[PDB]
Design a binder for this molecule. Sequence first.
Ligand SMILES: O=c1cc(-c2cccc(O)c2)oc2ccccc12
Ligand SMILES: [Zn+2]
Lengths: 161, 47
Amino acid sequence: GTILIDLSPDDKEFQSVEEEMQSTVREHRDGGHAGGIFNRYNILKIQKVCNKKLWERYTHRRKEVSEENHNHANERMLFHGSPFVNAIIHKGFDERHAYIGGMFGAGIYFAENSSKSNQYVYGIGGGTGCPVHKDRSCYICHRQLLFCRVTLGKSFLQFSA
Amino acid sequence: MAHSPPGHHSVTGRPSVNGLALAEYVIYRGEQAYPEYLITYQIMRPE
Ligand SMILES: O=c1cc(-c2cccc(O)c2)oc2ccccc12
Ligand SMILES: [Zn+2]
């Protein structure tokens, strides 16, 4: 069901997604161990993900949440990074993309910091790094993140370190 | 997957230590997220 549309670097949509990716880089408490050492990215490509069935599944659930929460879906745009992104774009998020050992329980995790999701691109803790050089800080190999629309509804606020 | 806390639809992980960290979020239903852009990139070696 899925098609990928390339955005031109001249397109304002390319530019605003690139800016959210670039401007939400931060330093991480692991000194780059999981995701590598960098202050910015070389964006090679931005593709829009189009799949009707997966979109309607999202908006159906969004309306339910919204009606249980005084007509407020509480929708955000958030990053997700994983070795399964090429599967998520084709079949959508499910049980297999959960973080069973995550600190808020076994669910699917999203970040406001792009560099946070970058830590999960090659696996939990960055896995063994890139497949070709086995380098978690590889500067040669191509990486991929998702920038996602996420419905939060009434969010349980967990304070945390 | 686990369930949401009763009476809620997600969990917000609100950073209470790393002052520069932004929030992280957890949903317990795959249907609460749509993967809208695929970004291909390299991290860049700092100068
Ligand atoms: O993008 C994320 C992906 C993942 C992740 C974790 C385990 C398995 C997986 O397929 C993705 O975890 C995160 C945790 C906090 C913030 C963002 C992420
Ligand atoms: Zn590599």
